[PDB]
Design a binder for this molecule. Sequence first.
Ligand SMILES: Nc1ncnc2c1ncn2[C@@H]1O[C@@H](COP(=O)(O)OP(=O)(O)OP(=O)(O)OP(=O)(O)OC[C@@H]2O[C@@H](n3cnc4c(N)ncnc43)[C@H](O)[C@H]2O)[C@H](O)[C@H]1O
Ligand SMILES: Nc1ncnc2c1ncn2[C@@H]1O[C@@H](COP(=O)(O)OP(=O)(O)OP(=O)(O)OP(=O)(O)OC[C@@H]2O[C@@H](n3cnc4c(N)ncnc43)[C@H](O)[C@H]2O)[C@H](O)[C@H]1O
Lengths: 530, 530
Amino acid sequence: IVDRAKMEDTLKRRFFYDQAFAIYGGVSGLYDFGPVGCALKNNIIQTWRQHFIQEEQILEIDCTMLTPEPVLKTSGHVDKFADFMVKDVKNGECFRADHLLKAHLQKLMSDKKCSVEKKSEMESVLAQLDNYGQQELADLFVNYNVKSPITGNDLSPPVSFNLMFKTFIGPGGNMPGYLRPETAQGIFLNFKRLLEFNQGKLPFAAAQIGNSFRNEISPRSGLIRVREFTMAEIEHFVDPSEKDHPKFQNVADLHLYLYSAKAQVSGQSARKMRLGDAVEQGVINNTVLGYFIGRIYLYLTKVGISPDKLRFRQHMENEMAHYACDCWDAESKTSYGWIEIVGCADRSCYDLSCHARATKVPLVAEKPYVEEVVPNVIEPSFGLGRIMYTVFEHTFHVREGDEQRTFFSFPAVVAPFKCSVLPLSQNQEFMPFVKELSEALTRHGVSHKVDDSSGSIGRRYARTDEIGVAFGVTIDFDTVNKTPHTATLRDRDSMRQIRAEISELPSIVQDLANGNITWADVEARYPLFE
Amino acid sequence: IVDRAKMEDTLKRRFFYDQAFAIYGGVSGLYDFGPVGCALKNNIIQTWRQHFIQEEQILEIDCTMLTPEPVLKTSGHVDKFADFMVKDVKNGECFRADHLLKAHLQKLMSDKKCSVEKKSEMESVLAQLDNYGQQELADLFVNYNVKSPITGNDLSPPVSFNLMFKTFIGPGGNMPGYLRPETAQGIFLNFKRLLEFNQGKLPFAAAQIGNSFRNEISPRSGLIRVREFTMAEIEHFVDPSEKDHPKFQNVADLHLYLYSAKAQVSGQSARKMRLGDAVEQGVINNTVLGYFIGRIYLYLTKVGISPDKLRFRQHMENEMAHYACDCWDAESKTSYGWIEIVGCADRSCYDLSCHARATKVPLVAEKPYVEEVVPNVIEPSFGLGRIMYTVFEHTFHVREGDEQRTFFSFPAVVAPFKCSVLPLSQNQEFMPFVKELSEALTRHGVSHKVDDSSGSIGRRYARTDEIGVAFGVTIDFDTVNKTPHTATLRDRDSMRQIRAEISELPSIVQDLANGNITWADVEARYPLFE
Ligand SMILES: Nc1ncnc2c1ncn2[C@@H]1O[C@@H](COP(=O)(O)OP(=O)(O)OP(=O)(O)OP(=O)(O)OC[C@@H]2O[C@@H](n3cnc4c(N)ncnc43)[C@H](O)[C@H]2O)[C@H](O)[C@H]1O
Ligand SMILES: Nc1ncnc2c1ncn2[C@@H]1O[C@@H](COP(=O)(O)OP(=O)(O)OP(=O)(O)OP(=O)(O)OC[C@@H]2O[C@@H](n3cnc4c(N)ncnc43)[C@H](O)[C@H]2O)[C@H](O)[C@H]1O
């Protein structure tokens, strides 16, 4: 439960992000990231690089965004990559039928005049929205007589709208192209050279961290629905008969909420199972999928996503992506409800075969005399933007004070900068201490910034808390004149303080940020300071 | 003088980069970067972040690539951002008139039948190619009767071709847009919030590191001419009356080749002046421009660009970009001749005014009672791709041996990974040493990789040299069985070796890579090893 309004005001005021081309009216689905937004975004990307690429020794490549039409036609995007769209016969307003129908039912379930039986009927309908096809969705639009949310007009029947941006490569219109809606294709077209890196053996994973474009019909979810974003995609090529991951046992003991396809059709809630158990019973197909689901859980959690607002939902029969057979999405509970922030599909051998057949170029591998096989690929897809937004709503808090101050309980690994060093005076009296502390923090690899802003220490930290700085060190006169020279350490979340010699604080902060020590531990060793 | 052919073969074989969508015929102007290509590209970006953003405390932002037409129409790109194009009346082959005329004259100057007087005439023409306008270029195409390079056909008159990619944002064609040809605009539309970070005082700089698109007419220069690339742009906002940079004296003593507009019109060669002297005489307008020209020189140099193949060329009167008044480009001598890899324009107050007037939104600042002013901006534009390519041609070498091996003398700060650790056996006998060395190197922040490839040590390093690994440590039996336990250190460029205790090598390599010690110094302290 978060006050989106108040938050968007803080994120825009401190400039995490904001409307792109604001002075022109702004384009929906487009936003720019300010200084703190980039710092946070970079921390999230770097953390991701460590968690996956570095942890699994994934091969990295950087493919182009521009894509010639033939490529996307083969992958099947030109035909299936789209959302159903509607528009009132009056003017040309377009809406994503998928979501309009959802906002309409929620409207009816909110009206007190709604009976219990109908409320239930509608709930069952929403829990199957991603299944309904061209026709099924057309009927519901009639049964509920759905009409334009603005000055209720009559909506035309739901039709498919390809989400890919169109363009022309080079002069003339002989080579029409698109902006890649995902990165996966780039890795597939370079399968041979990539497979070659691993001696030609399976399994192995390739990844990409770049921009993708989706000409979203009607973006109205802030950063949740942009037409341009950064995504990290991992393509894990494995033997279709060796779909077993050697490291699964590393996450087999995690307890996370799973919402299987069955539980969705049988109308029951999601369960909090143990990964290992989930695979045993058959809920989660194999262990390769199970490993990544665990690593994903760990990543999102480490970055700041709340376990109580995180779950993995499996796709339904006809919800499947045109390229997948099985899939699980990491959805986060937000002010916009449950939304996927990480897609993890098991798109068998769809891709490699399509390109192989179309280009007349074989894309396979061998196994022991020797047999050739088309690697099944599990694709963990990360929408960094959505992941960051979720972090905002899950760590945004209002201080218990009339002044209505706000702060983000950002984990030390993602916060703009771990420590904030703020002295009272700037005279050559404090510099000797500020300089030393700063450099000391630098030797400990602790990002920091010397606060100069005007106002009382309390007001100084107020700004620090707004952008989620994890810790702060106050350097007052008792630090310069008294001896031993001690400074004040402040915990962002609790606002509680500590007093210790300014030469020891560096290592203390380091351990606090690296999770080697608890704020509790700190209060146990050093004297409290109010 | 480099054998482009042989090089492109090594860059593509080891997978630094290669044709994008290769299995489809490949699209010109598009390439993908493989593992080593990304490692190198990332090192170049990181080095750039340290050199500029971190060194000048530049504010970073990340704007969108999609841009609504009105924005680019105001900036003047919709009208002036283009290259002159020609095409043979026969088929529809398009060519950049600018470059075709250049390739034609070079052809005539190469034929022995060419007289000295005409050769001179043509040289004077090429040294003014970027000045010739719509008409002047049309006449030359007649005087020299330029015809299609392929099966000589008759070329149509030179016409302007807007280099911007076209697209439509959202459903329908009511909001036509483009892909940003540069990033600068993004910073300008966010001038108010950016100026706000600096208390509203000048000067201050904002920067962006992202992708830009240029629908290049006929790309045929490898990575030199792509339709999609990564660029780092710095927008340095300064008081039009305070165009003086406080740090200029930090680079005032650099000797670099300058090729002023005069020297280009007066038909004389470029001079190797001292930055300070250059500003004195008035060659380089102010010191703000002089500082950046120095920092740029230092950056390119540190990354691997050869000083003897680097120069800064000033634009001519009508060569000016539609948004600039003065400018200097860092051009590198390559197999494609001199090409700009860094643009440094002094586009006064063109931008801020244009957007202010069009949006009816003021974009100014104040100065001491107080006067408002439109900040003059100096834009150092970096084409990371071109900078990396230049590094390739300037560090690519062929070993003096029949086998024709190749290697890149990459500076330690940009090489894929600084040290290569390669043992003879993998048995539990060597592991204790390999493990220790590896971790030790990690504690010293020295990137490395344990070589496993088969073949003799000499053949092992052959692969290491190909991707430019700076150093190598050989761990043989005399390392495991003998005592003290010593290993062999190998310099990539010289291939000369050294023998020292395996516990001291970590710090030795660190200093060698961080430029704290010379390979000469090493051979002076430790015993040589053949
Ligand atoms: N019968 C049917 N036929 C065809 N389609 C059917 C269908 N039934 C249901 N559908 C669904 O309709 C499509 C709607 O797509 P979208 O328009 O992208 O809406 P979405 O469901 O919120 O994102 P999506 O699910 O596509 O993200 P993805 O896995 O591609 O990639 C991974 C995601 O990328 C990121 N991401 C996606 N869109 C983003 C955006 N606009 N902004 C920021 N991040 C985004 C997310 O963080 C990450 O989870 C779904 O792809 C498809 O499953
Ligand atoms: N009268 C006139 N009217 C209009 N135009 C006239 C003119 N007389 C001459 N011209 C010239 O014609 C245009 C041709 O442009 P381009 O088509 O980009 O060719 P260029 O000169 O090699 O690059 P450019 O000079 O544009 O790079 P820029 O400063 O924008 O940005 C910085 C560069 O970005 C990078 N970069 C640019 N293009 C790249 C590419 N295709 N691939 C990779 N990197 C690229 C480079 O590394 C970096 O130096 C020049 O912009 C303009 O000066």
